[model samples]
Every structure is written in C-alpha cells, then in structure tokens.
Target: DVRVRVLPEVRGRLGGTVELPCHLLPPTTERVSQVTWQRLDGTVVAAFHPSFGVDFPNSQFSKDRLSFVRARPETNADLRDATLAFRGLRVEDEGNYTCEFATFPNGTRRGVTWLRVIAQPENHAEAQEVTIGPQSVAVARCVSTGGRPPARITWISSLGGEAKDTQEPGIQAGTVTIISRYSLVPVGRADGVKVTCRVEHESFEEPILLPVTLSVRYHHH
Candidate 1:
C-alpha cells in the first residue's frame, strides 16, 4: 500500500530558501522506481530514478538556479522521502508544484504544494522642502524601503516636478526601495503647493499616492 503526501502550502522570502516536502503517508512495501517534479504548467522541474539518479531537463528555465536536493540521502535515508529543496527562490518560482512517486505495482501517486513568495513593502513620507535657485532643489521626499521587489516611484504636480531616485539592496533578501524626491526649480506658485508621489508594486492593486504640500522658501520679488 502506497499513498503520496505533500505539504499543502508554503510561503518563502524572495531570494531565500524553501523546501517542498513530499512523502509516502501509509506504510508501503512497494518498490519505488521514479520520483518526478513539475510546475502547474507541466514544466519539468527535476526527476529522480534509481537507475539514472536524478536529472534536470529544463535548461532554459531553471539553468540559473542550481540548488536542488532529492531528499536527505545519507545514513538512514528513507526512500519514501521525495522531498525537493530549493535555494534563493525567485518570483517565477512562486506557484503550485507537483511531486510524483512511481512505485512498482502501485503506479504513480502525485501530490501538489503551492509556493507563495513575500517581499513586503513599507511606504512612508514626510514634509517637503525646496528653494528657488539655479540648481533643481528637492521639494519633497518619499521613502519606500526594505521591499522584496524594488518599488517604483514617480512624481506628480503642477510644478512640473521631476523625480530623482536612488536604490540599495535591502535586508533579509529583499530587493530595494527608493529615497525619491522632486528636484524641480521652486517658483512663487510652487510654495505651499500640492504634489504627489506615486508608488507601484505587485502587492497592491492601486498605486499608492503620497501627497506632499511643498514648503518652497521662495519670495515674490
């Protein structure tokens, strides 16, 4: 008697490690011949056969990702353990995965595990600043840091403000955020004026708008 089992779902951090667990539930005396894995789209991930060991067929998709282990095979290694390991999981790897175990006389039993990746973004803003001068002064500032995937930021205003952005690698395998600002020439109409910072990411359906009242130190000369 043989029954395939797998973890229902797993959440992973972007550019982190994750293990997709698959195993046989019931006690089985069946001879195992093959263990295979794939994505929901039928894209082959990897496979293990006693005769040929293991093979990764899809070079185009998974060539860059090199870390996969077919169970913990050492000492008292359990043959029923068809666990698959991954390192530095990517955005494309977030999806349902299938594990199939082929046993003699029992045929193939398959189970699925869904992987969801998280790269949470935190958005924050504050008072705006700028001055009338030849150089474009920063009128306002917006920050969205420690993001899994780098967030996009843009400026919107009647000042015809242009945004200057900077990015750095974030913590916990996160991608980036920006120290973004509107570096536009401050005019008489720019002081006490309203501007916006638009932030976009995969986590949100709507673009986050950060409204800033510009404190332009300008005069009507």
Candidate 2:
C-alpha cells in the first residue's frame, strides 16, 4: 500500500521550512526493487531504483534537497522514517502532491497530501509618482496575489494635510482575481499628497503597505 504523510501541517509563513512525509508499502519478498516520489502534477521528484542506486531523472530538486532515509523491507514495508524537507516554502508550493511506491504484485501504490502556504504580511506598500493639476480627481487601487490564507486590502490617505481612510475586502480562490479600488474626491493640493494601501493577515506579524499617488489632470468645479 502506498501512503503519504505531512508533518506539523500547522499554518506557516512564506519563508519557512516544512516536511512532507511519504511511506511505502510493506516490504515484499521479491526484493522490492524500487521506490519513487512524484508530485501530483505527474513529475518525478526523486527515485531509488535498486540497480540505479538513486537518481533524480525528471526532478529539478538539488541533490542536497532530496533524500530517502528509510527503505526497510522486512517489517511490513512501513517506512516510518521517510521525509522530504522543503526549505523556503513559497506560495507557489501550495497544492496537492503525491507519493508513490513501485513493487511487484501491487505494481504501484500512491498517496496524496496537500500543501498550504501561509502568507506573513506586514505593513508593506508601494508608491507611484504622478503629475497633477489643481482641482482634479485622483484614484488609486490595490491588488495582491498568491497566498494560502489570502489577503485583504485597506486604504489610507493623507491629502491636503488631512487624513482619511477606507477599507474594501478582496476576492477568493481560482483565476477569478480580486481588484480593490478607492477614490479620492475633489483632488487638490491633497491630490499631490500620498495615499497608501496596506495588507493584513491573521497569520502575519505586521501590515504591509502599498502606496500610490493621485494626480489630477485638470481643475474640477
């Protein structure tokens, strides 16, 4: 039987280390020629074939990154000590991954595991310079992508020496993206001022700020 296990699956930041556990079926009397690990997307990441010793044919993982610690055949083929150490896990690493074993009789057995990459957002922001004239209207928007728990957008403004802020929620999973927009009315000297958008997460330490400039084209009556 092919089985997969993930360790300490607790929520974590983007730049953290995590373990992916993969176990093989009970060892067979037939010498158990090979064991392999593959991602759910049909790419082999690591392999241990008897004659080949060990090789990563289609996998791009560094030799130092992948290892097979246990392959005992006698005791129920239970690989209690098998693990895959992923360093600096990114949002792109989030998804379903699979572990598989190759042997006689059963041929191949496979198991699946899901990887969730939590994002640690702090007060982070970016600003854009714009040329504006008096009495014009300026608008700015904020958008972010790729996080497991997702992210929310908040807007703040310091214009004409006065401060004002507003909040708007974002979208969810799928290619159906989220776009957040907030407007600054009656852009004047304040339009030349700075406006910022920051992101917050329940799992993050500090808020991340995104700033933009609102430049008015012309005067508004």
Candidate 3:
C-alpha cells in the first residue's frame, strides 16, 4: 500500500518564506513515475516526471519563488522526499496545498497542508488637538486598521502627567481593527505636549511610531 505524509497546518508572514514537506511511505522499490503538487482548486503548482522532468502549469503561482527543496537526481526514481518551498508569501497564498505521487502499480497517493499568512498593518493613527483647562480632561485617539492578528498599541507622552489608555478591538472582514484611546488631565501649562502612538506586530519589520502634538486650551479669567 502507498501512503503520503504532510504537515496539517503551517503559518507564515507576508513577504516571508515557508516549506511544506511531503514524504512517501512503505519504502517502495519501484521508481516514482510522476509527482504533482497542486492547490485545493486543482490548480497545478509544480510537478515532476521521470521522462518529462519538472513542470509548472499554474500561472497564478510564482515560478521564481516556487521550487523543490531537494534537487531531482538524473538517475534516481524514488520520490520519497518531495518537499516544496514557497518564497515571498502573500495574503493570496493562504490556502490548502496538496502533493500527489504516482509509482508503479501502487496507483496514486496524496497529502495536503494548509497555509496561513499574516498581514501587516497598513492604516495609521490620526492626530487630534483638543481644548482643556485646569481640572479638565482631554482624550486622544489613535486608530490602526487592516492588520491580521490584532496589533499591539502603546501610548507615549512627553509630559510627566498621568495618562490612561484603553484599547478596543474589532474584526473587519478577516483582519483586526484596533482603536486606542488615551485620556489626559491638564492642571497647568501642559499645552503643546508631544504624544506618540506605537504599533507593534509580527508582519512589520520594525515597530511603527506615530507622533502627534497636543493643543491644550486654558480658561481665561
């Protein structure tokens, strides 16, 4: 009997690389006649045959980034190791991947793996100026949207005054939208203070920093 094994699920970030391992079992002595890798919709990603060599028929998949983990030997017929490597992953690449092998009289055997891609935060925060007075309060809101796996939000202020921050998380489509609000109290000349909103996520290469200036209005007597 022929058997195939592959990962159940794989996680990757946008613009990153991931590998899917497929192995044939039972130690077949017969040479592997053909091997094909495809998507859930029957889109062929890559394939190899003893006589036809390697082939890629799917135009949607990138030929430059899709390649075999192990090089094909000119003489060897066993395809026990038919691992595939995907580079420059994108959001559109998230889905199921299947690998099928044909050898001798064993017919065909296949395995499947799922890919999940994480996206970076594209939206940024907004700068707001509010009026405040002695014993008065002001609120500053920062919004970051269009990111997979809710992003971490942080509040930074130049003034030594105490400030409270709250985060509201909502799901839009398949991604997360984060709304961060910071409340401040001004008793003196805290006007023109600098406040920064920092966003951290796995998709971003580095933390995103957004600075906003606060305008505090004092009551004139």
Candidate 4:
C-alpha cells in the first residue's frame, strides 16, 4: 500500500524557512517511482524521478526558495520520504501545499499541508502638545507598524475621552500599520492626566499598553 503521512498545518514567520513533513507509512517495499510537490492550483514546485532525475518546471517558484527536503536514495534507505522545504516565506505563500507520490501500481497518493505566516508588529505612542481650549483636540496618538494583520487599538484613561483609529499598508509586503488618535477637550488641569493606549495583536499573548501624559499649553494674555 502506498499510504503517506503528512502534517496538516505548518507555520513560519515572514521571510523565514518552513519545512513540510511527509513520508510513507513506515518502511515499505513499494516501488515509489517519483515524488512531486506543488501548489493547490497545480503549479508544480519540484519533482524527483528515479530514472530521469529532478525537475523544477515552474519558473515562478524560484529554485533558491523551493526544494526537496529529502533527496531520493542519496541518504535515505526509504524512498517514501517526500518532504518539501521552502524559504523566504511571503504573505502570498499562505495556502495549501500538496505532496504526491507516484507508486508503480497505486497511481498517485497525496496529502496537503496548510501554510500560515505571521509578522510581529512594532507598537509606539506619543502625546501631542495641545493648547488649552474648550474645543476637543487630539492629545495623544498610538501606532502599530509592520504587523501581519492590523492590530487593535483602544484608549484607557481615568478621564473621559474618545479614540479614533486608522490603518494603512506597512513598510513591507503582507503587513499593516495602524494609527489611533485620542481626543479630549484641553484644560490646564488635564495636563497631568495619564492615558493608556492598549494594543492587541495576534502575535502577542497579552495586549501591550502605551502610557502618555497630556501636554497642554496655556494661552498668553
């Protein structure tokens, strides 16, 4: 029997290496003629044939970033090992990867591994200089930069205030940058008020907090 075992899911950080593990069930005398790896869309990444050698048909899948983890017969006693190695993981690489084995009589046996990419974000905050006025003004701003998914922003303060959030593309591909404004009416007594900017991201176990002290200026007579 040409039964193959493969991991259902694999994860890697952006611009990193990911190894997809796949192998036949234990040792077998089955005549594994060839092994191939590809995307779910049928874009062949690479293939290895015992007689004809290895073939990388897709030029789009760069030779440097994609390759077989285990070459046939060189260091393996079992020909059932058909793991695939990938480097330079991009956001577009997050999808299903297929591994197929061509056996003599069994036709093709295959498995799929889902890929996930994560990018950590940088958090920052600053308090804007505000002039004491009855009208509301943005007293603080917080941002999360270069995150895989946009991070959440919220305001925590001892005084009543409101927060507005906006986001855009990050410095790199497959990332996002978010900015948040905390607004309130400027008053001399509010100068020492401490406001907390809380950020939530998938990469963090606990949400991070950025504390800022209101900087207010009094108008000259």
Candidate 5:
C-alpha cells in the first residue's frame, strides 16, 4: 500500500508560477500492472502511466512544458518530496490541483492542495537604437515599472564581446529602471559594435536580452 502528499500547499506568485511537490507511496511496479496519475479537475495537467510510459492523455494544455520529477521511495512515506513544476505561468493557474494514483488491490489513493496566485505588479523596459560617427560615443537606456520585490537591471555584452565601461543602474520613484548608456567616442566605422539592455525580473527563469546594434562611421580615423 502507498499514499501521496503535497508540500508547501501555500505559495506566492511573481507571474503566476506555481510549484507543487508530490510523491507516491511505494513506486508502483508494472510487474502486477501499472500505476497512473490523474487530476480531479477532469483536466489532466500531466501524468505517467505504466501502459503508455511517461505522457499525459490530456490535450487541453501544453504537455511538453510541465515537469513532474519522481522522488525517492520510502517504506513509511513512499512519495514525500517530488516536485511538480510549472513554467510561464498564467493567471488561470491559481486554483486547486489534485494528484490521484491508482494501483491494484490497493485500489486508488489521492492528495489535494490549493494554490493562490495574484498580480505581481507591473514590469516594463525600453531602449533606443543608435548610430554614431567615428571618434564618438554611443549609449542606450532602460527602465522598469511596477515590479514586486523591486527589480534589477544589468548591462552586458554578447559572447566574448567586451564593454569598454559600464555605469551603475539608477533607481527612481516606486519604480526601478536602468538609464545608463554607453559611449563609443573615438570609434571607427570598421568595427561592429552592439549595445545590450538586460532587464531582470524577479519571476522569470533568466534575464531578458534586449540588444541594439550601433553603426559607427569615421572620416578616415
């Protein structure tokens, strides 16, 4: 006999990302038959069946994006700390997600948890494209608006590229945005330069890359 459980039944949201942990009792073995995962909402989020391998029979959602990792089985607490992760969350994800498991002789078992998600404030950023003549400097600016837990902005170069100089990001109002531009003074038209605006949000996986290319021309420098 086995059971299921969910951890951190309560959590907050940045942009509707809900992460629920789950596990089974004894890790069902197909030797007798197979094990399965189902949702009480009648809308399958994801599941692993012995008959069909690791896949979801539900087509209502994007099955390829969600991740449900198995945890180590325990004789006492079969499924204890496996995590069910959701990405690129949306507002509709704020609700109850139930996990049900079926096995032979033991019949079926389940666990339920409620999740709440709310607006994570606003986030905005913008940068201007530029073109500079030879022997001149070029710069770009970025700003963030309405972000929870504040926000951070960073400047960087792509792949092995070098930034001659960078300034600390400036903060203002109840908002945070980066307004530090670069200078390509004494630049020649013979080189390819790119300026990037990196916006960092507290919710997303990685920083968003917003780069603007600069054209430099010199009168024979």
Candidate 6:
C-alpha cells in the first residue's frame, strides 16, 4: 500500500538535460532492498540493487547520459527521494519513464513521468515578383515558412522602413508561416534595392536574415 508521486510530464529541448522527480510519501523507515528505473516498455534503464551498490553494469544505462540524482543509503533512508537526471535528449528519447522502489515493509512503490522534446524550427524565406499599376505604387512580398513554435518575421529595407506583415497557420504541427508585404513609391529610381526579411524564433540564437534584391516594374511614360 505504498504511494509514489512523480511529475506527470516534463518538457526538454533536443540535446538538453531533464530531471524526472519521484518522491515517496510518509518517509518510510524500512530497509530498501533495491530501486529500479525503467521505460514503459519494460526496458531496464538503471537499477540499484543492495547486492550491486554504486555500480550498475546494465548496458541500457549510459554512464555518460544517465545517472541517479540521489544515492541509496544503507539504513532506513533508502530512497526517500529518487530522481533521475538524463542528459543529451534526442527525438527518439521522448517517452514515458517509471521508477520503482523496493522496500522491506512498504513492498514496492512506483512513479511515472513523461518526457517531451521540442524540435528546432526550419526556416525558408523568399521574395515575390512585384508589379506597379498606373497609381505608381509597387508592392513587394516576402514569405517565411516551415518553422516550429510560431517564428517571428520582420521585414527590413536598406531604404530604411518596416513592412506590413501577416501570419498564416503552418502546414505541420507546432509550426507557422508568415508573409510580409512592403509598398514602395518608385518616384525616380528604386530598382535593385536590398530588402531583408528576418525570421526570429526560440530555436535560433540570432535572427535568420533573408536578403532579397527588389526589382519593381516602373510605369513607362
């Protein structure tokens, strides 16, 4: 009749570290024979048996990427707090984890946690063709798509100004698409001007720059 409590879900980024916390209730005074961590599919992640202290020779547990947060003591405080620290998370590593504690009087207590890894966003930007009517006003468009977590898009011009932007739903999940349109009045000469569309997202340390040279069709008098 032992109770085990754990985080329901934990989120982490690719190549990042995550800590799954599992705590026992009432602080048992029973001797711990063993403690085991495993996946939902019965894969042995790591186990600490009284027979094998400190050294768990299981191949499923990578010494470099996986480790126990707290060591199991010999006496009554066997594993009051059993937390697992996992590092270098990958897309394939996203799954459910279980922690089982084997105590003398308490028998076995189990806790479960789910791990999720967020993927980096893929970005692509392109410039659209522009045509000027008799109004002598030309409109240029820039598009950015294939990004996760809804990336931010900004339009910059060497001519110095911002553009009107519109965001659209992405084709895939957790992604977004953006379109930025810039209006230019080609008074005299505004051809071959450099305009940049910058895409910013949580995955990028710096904004992704999409430079494009504008070629506006001029009204022939």
Top candidate by TM-score: 4
Please provide, for model 6 over 1-221, each residue's C-alpha lDDT reduced to its tens digit, 9 standing for 90 to 100: 23778888887766779888887776557677787778889887877665666443556458788877875544633456668787887656678888888878848878888877654566555544456444434345656664545667777776744477777766655446777776665533456667777878766788888777666555332
lDDT for model 6 comes to: 0.68
Instruction: Supply candidate 1's per-residue lDDT for 149.
Output: 62
- Clash pairs, candidate 4, are none
The Cα RMSD in angstroms, rounded to one decimal, for candidate 1 relative to the true structure is 8.0
lDDT of 3 by residue, 1-221 (tens): 23788888887866789998888876556557888988899888989786787777777676787887875564665557888888888767889998888867757788989888876666566544556555435446667776777777888876554444444444444467777766666543655567888888877778888887665546322
Candidate 6 residue-wise lDDT at 49: 69
- Candidates 2 and 6 compared: the better one by TM-score is 6
Candidate 5 lDDT by residue in tens digits, 101-134: 6645655666676654433323333333344444
Candidates 2 and 3, the one with greater TM-score = 3
Q: Which wins on lDDT, candidate 1 or candidate 2?
A: 1
lDDT of each: 0.74, 0.54, 0.73, 0.84, 0.50, 0.68
Whole-model alpha-carbon lDDT for candidate 4: 0.84
Residue pairs in collision within model 1? none
- The root-mean-square deviation over C-alpha atoms between each candidate and the true structure, in angstroms, is 8.0, 8.8, 6.2, 3.7, 12.2, 7.4
Candidate 4 lDDT, tens digit per residue, 65-179? 8877765557554477777777988888888888888876857878888887878899999999899888898999999999887889998998888889898999898899999
Off by over 4 Å in 2: 1-12, 25-31, 69-81, 123-148, 152-221
- Per-residue error for 197 in candidate 1, Å, reads 16
TM-score pick, better of 4 and 6: 4
What's model 5's TM-score? 0.43
Model 1, span 84-170: residue lDDT tens: 777677777778988888878858788989887767688977655556677777767889887756788887776565778899877
- Show where candidate 4 strays beyond 4 Å: 1-4, 27-31, 71-73, 203-206, 219-221
Clashing residue pairs for model 6: none
lDDT of 3 at 180: 78
